[PDB]
C-alpha cells in the first residue's frame, strides 16, 4: 500500500522562499542552550558537542511551522501520529547513543553503576544500573509521548470549546432581544475570556514543549560529555 | 611582634556540649542579661526567661535547644525558681540560647519596665504621629514609624501590667 499525500506547508514554503531569498540575522532561538554547553572558561571537549545545533534548529523550525500555525482553524498537523513521532525521536536519540557507543570507551559507562563501594554490589548497585539503563529508553519514550499527548489534548479541547461557542452563539443570540439578555451577555463574555485564555495557553505550551523536546536530547548528550581543563 | 587578641583577657568563655554526650536534667537556666558592654545579670540561675524575637515570643527554660534570636523592641521577663518576676524592656539586640543551659541576652539598651513612664510615652506617640504627617520624604516617614513602633510597644507593655 502506497499513499501519496502532501504536507500542509506549501504556502509557508512559498513565504520562506519569498522572505529568505536575502540574508537576515537571527537573535531569538527557542532552545538557546544547544549553543552554550560550557559555562566555565578554560573547559573544552574533544567530542563534537556542537553537532546537534543544526538538527536542533531545523527541528524547531519544522515543529514551529506545524504546531504554532495549527491554532488557525482547519490547519492540519500532518505528522500527528504516535509512531511517527516515535520514529523521529528514535532516529535522534539512538543516533546520538550509537555515536557514544561506537567510541568504544567502556569506562564512559562506569557512572551507570550507581552508588559507592559501600553499597552491596549485587543487591543494590546492579539493580540501580538496570533501572538507569531502562530509564534511558523510558526518557526517549516519555519525550515522544509528551510531545504527542500535549498537542492531541490541546486540540481536542479547542475543538470542543469552539463547537460549544458556535452552538450558543448561533442558537441563543436572540436572547439579546429578550428579557434574559443579561444571562446571554454574561455567558458570551465568559466564552470570549475562555477563548483568549485557551489561545494564549496553547501558544505558550507549543514553544515550551519544543524547548523540552530539544532539552531531553541535549541532556542525553551532556550525560556522557567529559570536559578537560586548559593548562 | 605579635599582639594579644582582645578576647584573651576574658576568662568567662562559652561552654558548648559535645553532641555525642549524655543528657543532663537541669532545673536552672544561667542567664546573662547585658547592656552596652555591661551585665545587668551575670550567670544568674533562673527558672525561665521570656523574650520577643522577630518571629514571635519564646519561653526559654533549662535545656532549650541551641538557637539565635533577633530581638525586637519589647519587654523581657525573667522568672526565678523562688517565684519572683523581674521585667525589663529592650530596644533590640540578640539572644543566644545554648543547649548546655545558658542564655546570653545582649541588648543595646535594657531598662526595667518601672523606669519607663506611660504619660511620657503616650504624649510622644502623639507628637511622632504629627511628625509622620509632616515627614518630608519616604525615608523620614520610615524613621518616624520606627519610633512609633517602639513607643506603642512601650505603651502596650505598661498597659498590660
Amino acid at each position: 500500500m502506497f499513499l501519496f499525500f502532501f504536507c500542509d506547508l506549501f504556502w509557508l514554503r512559498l513565504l520562506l522562499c519569498m522572505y529568505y531569498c536575502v540574508w537576515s540575522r537571527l537573535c531569538f532561538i527557542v532552545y538557546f542552550n544547544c549553543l552554550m554547553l560550557i559555562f566555565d572558561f578554560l573547559l573544552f571537549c574533544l567530542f563534537d558537542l556542537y553537532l546537534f545545533v543544526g538538527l536542533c534548529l531545523f527541528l524547531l523550525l519544522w515543529f514551529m511551522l506545524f504546531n504554532l500555525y495549527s491554532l488557525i482553524l482547519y490547519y492540519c498537523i500532518t505528522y500527528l501520529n504516535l509512531y511517527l513521532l516515535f520514529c523521529i525521536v528514535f532516529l535522534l536519540y539512538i543516533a546520538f547513543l550509537f555515536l557514544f557507543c561506537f567510541l568504544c570507551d567502556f569506562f564512559l559507562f562506569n557512572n551507570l553503576l550507581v552508588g559507592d563501594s559501600f553499597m552491596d554490589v549485587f543487591f543494590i548497585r546492579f539493580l540501580l544500573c538496570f533501572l538507569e539503563c531502562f530509564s534511558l529508553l523510558c526518557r526517549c519514550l516519555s519525550t515522544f509521548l509528551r510531545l504527542f499527548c500535549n498537542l492531541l489534548s490541546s486540540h481536542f479541547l479547542l475543538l470542543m470549546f469552539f463547537d460549544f461557542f458556535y452552538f450558543i452563539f448561533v442558537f441563543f443570540f436572540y436572547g439579546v432581544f429578550c428579557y434574559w439578555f443579561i444571562l446571554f451577555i454574561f455567558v458570551f463574555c465568559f466564552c470570549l475570556l475562555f477563548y483568549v485564555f485557551l489561545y494564549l495557553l496553547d501558544l505558550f505550551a507549543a514553544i515550551l514543549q519544543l524547548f523540552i523536546f530539544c532539552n531531553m536530547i541535549l541532556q542525553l548528550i551532556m550525560d556522557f560529555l567529559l570536559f578537560l581543563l586548559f593548562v | 611582634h605579635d599582639l594579644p587578641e582582645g578576647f584573651e583577657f576574658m576568662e568567662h568563655k562559652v561552654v558548648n556540649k559535645d553532641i555525642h554526650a549524655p543528657h543532663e536534667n537541669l532545673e536552672t537556666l544561667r542567664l546573662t542579661l547585658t547592656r552596652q558592654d555591661e551585665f545587668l545579670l551575670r550567670e544568674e540561675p533562673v527558672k525561665c526567661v521570656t523574650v520577643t524575637g522577630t518571629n514571635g515570643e519564646y519561653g526559654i527554660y533549662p535545656g532549650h535547644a541551641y538557637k539565635i534570636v533577633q530581638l525586637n523592641p519589647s519587654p523581657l521577663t525573667v522568672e526565678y525558681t523562688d517565684g519572683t518576676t523581674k521585667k525589663y524592656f529592650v530596644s533590640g539586640g540578640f539572644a543566644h540560647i545554648n543547649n548546655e543551659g545558658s542564655c546570653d541576652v545582649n541588648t543595646v539598651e535594657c531598662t526595667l519596665l518601672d523606669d519607663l513612664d506611660l504619660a511620657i510615652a503616650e504624649k510622644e506617640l502623639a507628637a511622632q504621629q504629627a511628625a509622620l504627617g509632616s515627614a518630608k520624604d519616604d525615608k523620614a516617614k520610615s524613621v518616624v514609624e520606627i519610633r512609633i513602633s517602639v513607643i506603642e510597644a512601650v505603651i502596650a507593655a505598661l498597659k498590660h501590667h
Binding site: - | C48, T50, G56, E57, Y58, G59, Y61
Partner: protein, 59 residues
Amino acid sequence: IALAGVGLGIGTIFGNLLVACARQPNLTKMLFNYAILGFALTEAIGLFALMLAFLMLFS
C-alpha cells in the same frame, strides 16, 4: 470513612498544641482550653457521620 478526616484532624490540633506549648509553656492552661474547643467541634462533625452510620445500619 468520614471519621478518618475527623480523627486525623484531632491529631493535627494536638500536634500543634505540643509545639505551641513547647514554644511558650506558660500559656499551656490557656492553649489547652482552645485545644479542647477544637476537639469539641470536630468530634461534633463525627457524630453526624456516626448518626448516618446508625440510621442506615438499623433501617
